[PDB]
Amino acid sequence: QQRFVYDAYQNLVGYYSDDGNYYCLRACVSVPVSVIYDKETKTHATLFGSVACEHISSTMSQYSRSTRSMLKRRDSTYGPLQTPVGCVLGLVNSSLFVEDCKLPLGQSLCALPDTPVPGEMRLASIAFNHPIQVDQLNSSYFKLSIPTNFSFGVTQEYIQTTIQKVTVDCKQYVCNGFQKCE
Amino acid sequence: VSKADGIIYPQGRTYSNITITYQGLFPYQGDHGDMYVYSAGHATGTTPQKLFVANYSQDVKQFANGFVVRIGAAANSTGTVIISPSTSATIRKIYPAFMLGSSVGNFSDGKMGRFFNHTLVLLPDGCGTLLRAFYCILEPRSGNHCPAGNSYTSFATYHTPATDCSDGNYNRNASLNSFKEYFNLRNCTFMYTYNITEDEILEWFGITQTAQGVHLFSSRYVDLYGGNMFQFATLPVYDTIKYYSIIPHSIRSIQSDRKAWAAFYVYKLQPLTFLLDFSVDGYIRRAIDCGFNDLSQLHCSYESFDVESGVYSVSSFEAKPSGSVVEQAEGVECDF
Amino acid sequence: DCGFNDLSQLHCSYESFDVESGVYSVSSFEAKPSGSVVEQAEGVECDF
Amino acid sequence: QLLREYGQFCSKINQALHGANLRQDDSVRNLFASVKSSQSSPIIPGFGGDFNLTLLEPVSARSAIEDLLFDKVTIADPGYMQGYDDCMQQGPASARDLICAQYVAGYKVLPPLMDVNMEAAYTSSLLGSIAGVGWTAGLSSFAAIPFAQSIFYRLNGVGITQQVLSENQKLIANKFNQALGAMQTGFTTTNEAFQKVQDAVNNNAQALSKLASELSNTFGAISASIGDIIQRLDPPEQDAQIDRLINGRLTTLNAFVAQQLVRSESAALSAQLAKDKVNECVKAQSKRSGFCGQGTHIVSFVVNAPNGLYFMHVGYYPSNHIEVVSAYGLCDAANPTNCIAPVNGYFIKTNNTRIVDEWSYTGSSFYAPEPITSLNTKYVAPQVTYQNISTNLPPPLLG
Amino acid sequence: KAQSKRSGFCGQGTHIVSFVVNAPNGLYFMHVGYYPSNHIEVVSAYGLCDAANPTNCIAPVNGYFIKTNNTRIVDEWSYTGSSFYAPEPITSLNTK
C-alpha cells in the first residue's frame, strides 16, 4: 500500500509502480579515477578504480566529470588492459619481475617508466626475494650453511627527542596591538 | 598556457618571483578560437571593382564575459592572398574591427548583423596608426549597395594604400569616412582615440565589461614582446553588451601590388582558476589551467609547476542519465 | 592591579597572589610610529 | 562555484590522506623486510615429524589456520578487480554495504600493497627458519635440523634434563600436538585475541560508515541533496543553503582526516612492536617472562591477520608441584676447600630406594632424581651454607 | 654503550659497535653491523663420542663440528666458528 520503501537512513531503496511491479532503486554510481605519474620521464597513465573496462571507453562520452579532458594517450595508444587493481590505460604488460619499484599500483603491481621519446609505462609484478634454501638431511648428519666471506655495513637511525619550544603573546596576536580590540 | 597566451595580468597588483593560484577571466587551454581574415578588394590594374569580404558582418556572436584577440600571429613570412590563390605576398600584421551591440535587429532586407541604437564601434585607421571607440548610434543610409539601400550585400570599411597610406602622412579619416558611407552617425556619445606605434611584432588585445565601465587591455603599452595584457583604456558603457560582430575590412590595393594580411584569432574568456608563475621582472612567463587535465589539477593542488612521482586520486567520472521517467496519478479526461 | 607591571599580570593570569619561580613570556613592546607619509595622485579631482 | 572560493580546503584534505597512505605502505615494506629470513629450509609435507604442525603448512597458498582465521572474521571485502561491476548489479542491499556506497559517496578504499599470496610467502619462509635457527649462536649461520631436535634443545634450555627428554620423547610430542589441536577450535567470542582482530576490522568499518551517514545528515537545508534544494528554492536562498551543506561536509572530512592520522600513528608504533616480537619470540626462544607468552616460552608461530600479524606462542606450564629438601652446595668433610654447586638444577635428598641423606641432582623445570656427575656440577669456593659430607661422596668430590 | 645480542633492535646483521652524534631535533645513531656473504653448505655433526667410551662425548662451543676432506684424512672432524668458515683442529678449549 505504501509505494515508497525507505532504508534505515531514509534513502529511497524501493518503489511500487502503477503497473504493480516492485522496482529496486539504486543511486547512479560514479567511476573512480586515479593517475600514475613519473616526474623523471614525465609519463602519465590512468587507472580507472575497480572498473572491468566494459564501462570505460576512450571517448568516455557516457561518463561526465568536472575535468575538461582526459590524458592524450597519443602515439602507441594501446587498448585498455584489465588488471587486479582495475582497468588501466597507458600500461602494457611487460611480464617483468622487480624486487622493488618506485611506483606501486596494488597487490603486487608496479608501473615501470621507459628510459628516455620515452615509451608508455609497462605493468610489472613484484617478485618475492627467495632466501637461501638448505635441505634437512634424513641422516643424523645435518646440512650447515656458513659464510666464507664477511662485510661491514653501517645502519643510520634518527630518533627525535625534542620539538621546537614556542611561546606566543596571545594579546598581541589577537589584537595586533590595537587598544579598541584590547 | 605554457607560453601564457592570452593571459590578462591582475590589474589590482603586481607579484614578483612567486607562484600563486589566481581566479580571473581566462581562455580555455588548447582553444583554437575563431579565425577572421581581411583580404584586398577585387581590382582591374588601375581601378578596384568591388570590396572582397566574408560573411563576418552577418554573423552575430554573444559577448559573454569578453574575448582576447591574437593579432599579427604570422608576420614577415611567405603567404597567399585570400582574393587570389595564385598570388603570393609577404604576410603583414592587420588590426581587427569590432562592433558590439546590446540588442540585435534585422536589416531592411532582413539580413542579420544589424544592431540597435546602443552600439560600440572600434575601427583602426591610417594603416593601423590609431584606434577609435564611440557609441555613435548608427542610422542606415539609402544608397546603391547600402544597408537601407536596394541590392544591399554587406557593410564594410575600406582603405587605399596608394593615397591613404603614406610615409609622409597617413589619412586618419579614411576608415571613418568608409564607415560613414554605410551608416550615418547620430546622437554620438564619448569618442576616444588611442595612438598605435607601427611594428610587425605579435600583440594581444582583450575587451571585457565591468560595472565601472567597459575595460580595454593592450599588450603593447606594458609588455609588447611578452604578450601579457594590461588595461590601457576605460569606456563609459553601462548597458550590458550581449552581442558582438566583426566588421570586414577590404584594402583597395592596385591589382599588380597586393599584401597578405595576418588572420586574427578571437578566444572567449571564462572564469577559471589558473596557477601563475611570476618572474623577478614580474611578467607571467608560464601558467597552468587546472580544469584542462588531471595532471594540471595536481599541479594547482600542490601550487607547484613540479609534482613528485606517485599515484594520485583525481576527480571521478559521474554517470550521465539516458532519459527522464515521470509517474503520477492520471490528470483525468474531460468528457464530451 | 594587572596593568601596572608584568609580574602583576602573571599574578592575575594564575589568579593567585603567589607565582612559582620561572621565566614567563609577557606582553611585547610595540614600536611607536615616528611620522605620517601621504602620497596622492596629482590632480585627478572628482568634478562637482 | 561556491566550492571554488573555498579552493585549497578540499586539496589539503586530499593531500593529508595521500601522505598517510604512503606512510602505511612504507611501514608494510619495513616490517616484511625484517620478517624475511636470510636462510630458510623449504617446507615439505610432514614437516615437523612427530610434531603435527600441518595446520601451519600451506595448502598447495595460505595456511589452514590462516584461512580459518580469515573465514571466522566478519569482514566485507572490496572486489578490487571488477568491484564496481559487482556493485553495478548489487541486488537487495545487505547491511548498507560500504563498498557499494563508496562509489556514490566518492570515497575509495586502496588495495593493500602486498598480495595474500605474497604475504603468505614471507610467513612460509619464517616457518622454515624457526626449525633451523641454530643452537650455537647461528645469527649469520643456518643449520638445517629437524623441528624435533630444535624442540629438545629448547627444553634442555628451560632446565628439563636430556635423559628425561629421551624417555618422554613420545609423551612430549603428544602433549605438544594437543596444544596445537586446541588452536583450531581456539577462535571464538571468548578468545581475547580473536576479539582484537574483529575490533580492528570494526574500527575501519566505522570510519567509512561515518562518511556515508554524514552525507545523509542535512545541515540547515530542506534536503541533503544539492539538486533537491535547487529545484525547490529560489537562487539567492539556494546559495545560503548550499553553503551550510558545504561547511558541514568540509568539517566532516577534516574530522575524518584527523582520525585517520591518529590511527596511522598508532599502527606504526604497533608495527614496530610486531617486528620486535618476531625477532624476540618467533626467531628465538625468549628467556624474558611474559614478553611473548605466559609460562616458559619454547617456540612461536606467526600467521598473517586482516589488519596485522597473529602470533601463537607455545609455553611450558608446571603442574603437580611437590616440596623437597635441597642444599646450596656439597663439600667433602676431609677437604673443606673442594665443593660443588648444581648447574641449571637443585641438589636434593634421595630417601627413595637409597640411604638417608643421599644427594641427587634434579633439573629445575622437571623433578627427576639423577646421580650427581661432573657434567651437572661446577666447583665453587666453600661457604658456611654448603653441607659437608663425610661418606657416600658423589664422584666430583672424590679426591 | 654495549654490543647487543638482540638482532634488528639496533641494526640489521650482527651489531658490533654503535656511535651517536647530535641532530637538530634529536639524536642521530650510526650502527656498525656484521654481514655474512658467500655462504657454503657443509656436513656437520651434533656431537662426537669415542667408540671405546660411549659416555665420553664432546659438543662444539659457539661453533659447529665439520667434516674435512681437504688436506686431511677422510672422516676427519674440525671445528669452525659459527660466524666465519675456517677449519681448525678440535681442542679442549673449543669443546664441552
Side-chain angles (χ1 to χ4, degrees), chain A residues 4-175:
Chain A
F4 305 111
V5 187
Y6 282 80
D7 67 357
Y9 313 97
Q10 278 73 227
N11 308 327
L12 192 58
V13 284
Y15 176 72
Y16 280 96
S17 288
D18 293 346
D19 48 55
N21 308 142
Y22 176 74
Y23 293 115
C24 291
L25 192 41
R26 216 161 312 277
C28 308
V29 273
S30 299
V31 167
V33 186
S34 50
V35 52
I36 318 147
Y37 169 68
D38 182 42
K39 183 180 180 178
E40 230 70 23
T41 57
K42 284 180 172 53
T43 50
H44 42 82
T46 5
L47 175 67
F48 289 95
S50 56
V51 190
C53 105
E54 291 94 35
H55 307 269
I56 94 112
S57 66
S58 58
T59 313
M60 260 298 184
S61 55
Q62 67 282 345
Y63 300 126
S64 54
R65 75 169 171 184
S66 58
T67 302
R68 190 149 44 94
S69 75
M70 308 167 54
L71 304 175
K72 201 66 62 182
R73 203 88 322 105
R74 72 282 150 267
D75 200 13
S76 58
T77 192
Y78 286 133
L81 179 62
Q82 185 56 30
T83 78
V85 286
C87 162
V88 74
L89 202 48
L91 273 193
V92 224
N93 190 19
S94 55
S95 73
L96 283 183
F97 298 94
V98 276
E99 61 280 337
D100 43 22
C101 62
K102 300 294 296 299
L103 312 176
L105 308 188
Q107 298 286 90
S108 274
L109 303 163
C110 302
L112 291 187
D114 301 22
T115 312
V117 178
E120 274 187 358
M121 323 177 69
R122 301 144 305 187
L123 174 68
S125 50
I126 294 177
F128 169 65
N129 191 22
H130 296 287
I132 313 177
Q133 305 292 338
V134 196
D135 299 354
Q136 296 180 3
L137 301 181
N138 197 21
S139 184
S140 57
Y141 301 100
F142 67 95
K143 256 181 181 179
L144 168 74
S145 180
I146 179 170
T148 55
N149 195 21
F150 71 103
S151 61
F152 282 96
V154 181
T155 306
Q156 307 173 20
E157 177 178 358
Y158 162 70
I159 313 184
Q160 183 173 10
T161 68
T162 66
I163 64 148
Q164 207 175 22
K165 295 178 302 180
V166 183
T167 36
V168 311
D169 189 9
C170 177
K171 194 175 186 55
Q172 183 198 180
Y173 181 96
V174 175
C175 287

Side-chain angles (χ1 to χ4, degrees), chain B residues 124-323:
Chain B
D125 217 322
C127 272
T129 41
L130 71 158
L131 177 68
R132 47 182 99 268
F134 37 77
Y135 255 133
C136 266
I137 300 184
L138 310 176
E139 300 298 325
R141 291 191 61 127
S142 54
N144 201 5
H145 310 113
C146 254
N150 297 354
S151 77
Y152 166 68
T153 48
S154 165
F155 59 89
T157 43
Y158 65 87
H159 116 276
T160 303
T163 58
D164 309 336
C165 203
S166 176
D167 57 336
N169 191 26
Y170 299 88
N171 190 7
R172 308 181 79 91
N173 280 349
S175 303
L176 186 59
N177 291 352
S178 306
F179 194 64
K180 284 176 177 178
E181 302 169 9
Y182 296 85
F183 290 106
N184 269 337
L185 283 327
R186 212 58 51 92
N187 304 348
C188 195
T189 328
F190 67 97
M191 210 283 199
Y192 289 152
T193 282
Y194 336 99
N195 290 357
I196 309 174
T197 24
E198 262 57 49
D199 57 0
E200 292 289 332
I201 312 178
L202 155 83
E203 78 177 62
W204 275 89
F205 166 82
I207 165 177
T208 69
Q209 187 197 355
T210 67
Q212 296 88 10
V214 165
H215 285 356
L216 250 57
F217 310 85
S218 177
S219 72
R220 316 184 51 91
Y221 291 77
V222 179
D223 199 14
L224 165 69
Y225 309 102
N228 289 163
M229 296 162 34
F230 293 72
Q231 183 180 344
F232 77 105
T234 307
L235 302 184
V237 170
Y238 292 93
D239 53 71
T240 315
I241 309 182
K242 306 293 296 299
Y243 313 97
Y244 80 95
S245 181
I246 277 76
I247 319 170
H249 187 94
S250 283
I251 288 86
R252 303 193 70 176
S253 59
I254 295 301
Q255 189 181 26
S256 70
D257 182 30
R258 286 169 173 173
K259 295 299 183 304
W261 304 112
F264 64 91
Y265 306 82
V266 169
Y267 311 92
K268 288 303 180 61
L269 287 172
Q270 304 94 9
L272 276 164
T273 308
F274 266 41
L275 183 62
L276 298 180
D277 188 22
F278 294 88
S279 42
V280 186
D281 45 90
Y283 295 131
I284 314 179
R285 303 311 179 182
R286 52 177 190 177
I288 270 185
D289 177 21
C290 328
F292 185 68
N293 58 304
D294 295 329
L295 268 191
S296 288
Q297 153 200 359
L298 293 182
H299 286 287
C300 293
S301 161
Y302 289 88
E303 71 178 359
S304 176
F305 276 77
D306 291 346
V307 158
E308 305 300 322
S309 310
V311 183
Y312 298 86
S313 180
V314 281
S315 58
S316 44
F317 276 93
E318 305 124 15
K320 184 190 312 174
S322 178

